[PDB]
């Protein structure tokens, strides 16, 4: 599971 | 920016 917020 | 990989 990969999550990114930028 | 939101990125999800499951």
Numbering used by the authors:
A (entry chain B), B (entry chain A): 1 to 6
What does the literature reporting this entry say, word for word?
We determine nine polymorphic crystal structures of the APR segments of glucagon-like peptides 1 and 2, and exendin and its derivatives. We propose that the pH-dependent changes of the protonation states of glutamate/aspartate residues of APRs initiate switching between the amyloid and the folded, monomeric forms of the hormones. Our results highlight the dual role of short aggregation core motifs in reversible amyloid formation and receptor binding.
Two polymorphic crystal forms could be grown from solutions of APRex-4. In polymorph B of the same system, shifted interfaces could be found which are stabilized by different interactions. An aromatic cluster is formed in both polymorphs of APRex-4. At pHs where Glu/Asp side chains become protonated, charge frustration ceases as side chains establish intersheet H-bonds. For example, protonated Glu forms H-bond either with the opposing Glu (S1 of polymorph A, S3 of Polymorph B in APRex-4 Fig. 6c), or with the indole rings of Trp(s) (S2 of Polymorph B Fig. 4e). Polymorphs formed in pure aqueous solution are laterally displaced, as the side chains of Tyr, Glu, and Gln rather form H-bonds with the surrounding water molecules. Aromatic side chains form intrasheet aromatic ladders in the two parallel structures of APRGLP2 and APRTc5b (polymorph D), as well as in both polymorphic structures of APRex-4. Interestingly, exendin-derived hexapeptides showed the greatest structural plasticity that is reflected in multiple β-sheeted conformers giving rise to several polymorphs.
